[PDB]
C-alpha cells in the first residue's frame, strides 16, 4: 500500500468539478459524427448577432410585435426625445434580447455594443435622427443639447435603411456586473435632428426598429444561473 494522505475537500461533490469517472457502457462506440451545417463553439458567437430590442414596452404594446418598433411623426417639428434605454446589457429592455439573455448567465461583462436602427417609412420619406449614448456618472439627458455633448451619431435616412452605431465600453473598471445595482452604463436617447418629412399622399407615421449585438470587443465571464426565466411547480412527463 502506497503511503497516501487524505485532503481537506475529499469525498465532496462539486457541481463544477472536473474529474474522470468510469464508463457505464464499456466498449461502446458512439454513432460516427457527421457534416452538420452551422455549428457553434463559443457563446460569444451569439452575442455577436443582431437581436431585436423590445424598445416599446409600455403596458400598451407589451404582447405584440409593436413593442419592437417606434413610431415617428411628420407632425413633430422640434428637438423632441423619442425614447431612451439603460445600457447595461442585462438592463431593461435589452436584457431579453439574445445578448442580454446570454449575458444573463454570467456575472461579469465588458466590451462595446453595436446598436443598429432601421427606418421603415415610405421610400419618399426622409428624416435625420440623432442617436446618442451618454456616459454614466450623470443622469438621463433632458434636452437635445444635453444629449449630444456625449458620444453620438447624426443619422441621415436616405437610401440605406439601417445605420449601426456603437456604445464604446467606457468603464471605470474593466468588467461590469451583468446584474447592475443602482450603477448604470449611461443610456441611449433618441432625438429629432430634422423633422420626419413626407410628400402629399403619404403615411405621416414611421416605424423604426432597433437591434443590438456585441463588438469584436465584447466579452462575458463568471458563469451563473439565468434570472430571465423561472420554474415554479413541476413539469409534466
Amino acid at each position: 500500500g502506497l503511503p497516501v494522505f487524505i485532503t481537506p475537500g475529499s469525498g465532496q461533490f462539486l457541481t463544477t468539478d472536473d474529474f474522470q469517472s468510469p464508463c457505464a457502457l464499456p466498449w461502446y462506440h458512439p454513432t460516427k459524427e457527421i457534416s452538420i451545417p452551422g455549428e457553434v463553439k463559443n457563446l460569444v458567437e451569439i452575442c455577436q448577432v443582431d437581436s431585436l430590442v423590445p424598445i416599446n414596452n409600455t403596458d400598451t404594446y407589451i404582447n405584440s410585435e409593436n413593442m419592437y418598433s417606434v413610431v415617428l411623426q411628420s407632425s413633430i417639428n422640434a428637438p423632441d426625445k423619442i425614447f431612451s434605454i439603460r445600457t447595461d446589457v442585462a438592463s431593461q429592455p435589452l436584457a431579453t434580447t439574445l445578448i442580454g439573455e446570454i449575458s444573463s448567465y454570467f456575472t461579469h461583462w465588458t466590451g462595446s455594443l453595436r446598436f443598429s436602427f432601421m427606418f421603415c417609412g415610405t421610400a419618399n420619406t426622409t428624416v435625420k435622427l440623432l442617436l446618442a449614448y451618454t456616459p454614466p456618472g450623470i443622469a438621463e439627458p433632458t434636452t437635445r443639447k444635453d444629449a449630444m455633448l456625449g458620444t453620438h451619431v447624426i443619422w441621415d435616412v436616405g437610401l440605406q435603411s439601417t445605420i449601426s452605431m456603437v456604445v464604446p465600453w467606457i468603464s471605470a473598471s474593466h468588467y461590469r456586473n451583468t446584474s447592475p445595482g443602482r450603477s448604470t452604463s449611461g443610456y441611449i436617447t433618441c432625438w429629432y435632428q430634422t423633422r420626419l418629412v413626407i410628400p402629399p399622399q403619404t403615411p405621416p407615421t414611421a416605424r423604426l426598429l432597433c437591434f443590438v449585438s456585441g463588438c469584436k470587443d465584447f466579452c462575458l465571464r463568471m458563469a451563473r444561473d439565468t434570472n430571465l426565466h423561472l420554474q415554479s411547480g413541476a413539469i409534466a412527463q
Partner: peptide, 18 residues
C-alpha cells in the same frame, strides 16, 4: 421564444421602401 430573438436564424427583411 420571443420574436426579435428570431434573427438568430437564417433570415432577411423585406422593407418595401428598400
Amino acid at each position: 421564444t420571443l420574436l426579435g430573438n428570431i434573427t438568430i436564424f437564417p433570415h432577411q427583411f423585406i422593407n418595401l421602401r428598400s
